[PDB]
Design a protein around this ligand. Sequence first.
Ligand SMILES: [Ca+2]
Ligand SMILES: [Ca+2]
Length: 279
Amino acid sequence: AAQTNAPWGLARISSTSPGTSTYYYDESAGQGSCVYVIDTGIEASHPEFEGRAQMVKTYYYSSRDGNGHGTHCAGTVGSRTYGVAKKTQLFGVKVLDDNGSGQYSTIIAGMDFVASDKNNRNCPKGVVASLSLGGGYSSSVNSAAARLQSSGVMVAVAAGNNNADARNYSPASEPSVCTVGASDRYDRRSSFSNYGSVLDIFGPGTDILSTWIGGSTRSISGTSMATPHVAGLAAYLMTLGKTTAASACRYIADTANKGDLSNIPFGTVNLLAYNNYQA
Ligand SMILES: [Ca+2]
Ligand SMILES: [Ca+2]
């Protein structure tokens, strides 16, 4: 398959080089995989989700995404136009309030919820969790992300937007999950992207067009935007049977574009998510 004039991030993950415009991807498009978007929720009614998104849990008065952040990330995972895995199933877990903030206890509960809830879903190609959130280092947040990963879910988490070492942020600092930094369309590290040894991979994160609430779209930046690229890529690759939840992060790093990125401090992987698609 080939989406012309795709968002640059989608084009980038299907190219060995920056600057392309077409997103090349296998028609399977993550069909049969499921991605939990643990965030502010998802506006499942967005036409761009084609009925493939649904709220499964909220820790607030409503399951409605009153912010847009979760709807944006979900769209990068699996919306028709802005998504990596255009046929995946999206499950919304609203651990963040409509201001985009969430208590660590609620984020941990949301992670434990996904580890259980996935056992009630038909996800033959496997389960992914996209965590475009984080705060200061927390052993308990890290332990929750580790549990989710151990439960058999491919956990992708944002490195953080502090232009610092992700070692001091959670769940970014949890070694066992897939910690995602952000790059821009010119293959530089996003100016805000955290770095450090705990990063496993980079994904497009600067000026990322995706779904927004009110059935709209908008472009925003963050490791929160790179994370769903990698989550979608994982779902996409799991559907192709190229990898499993336990090995998806390592596989993506092994198959990533190596050395393409600039502004990568010594000790940080220079690896950009890449789907290695060949027509
Ligand atoms: Ca290259
Ligand atoms: Ca890791």
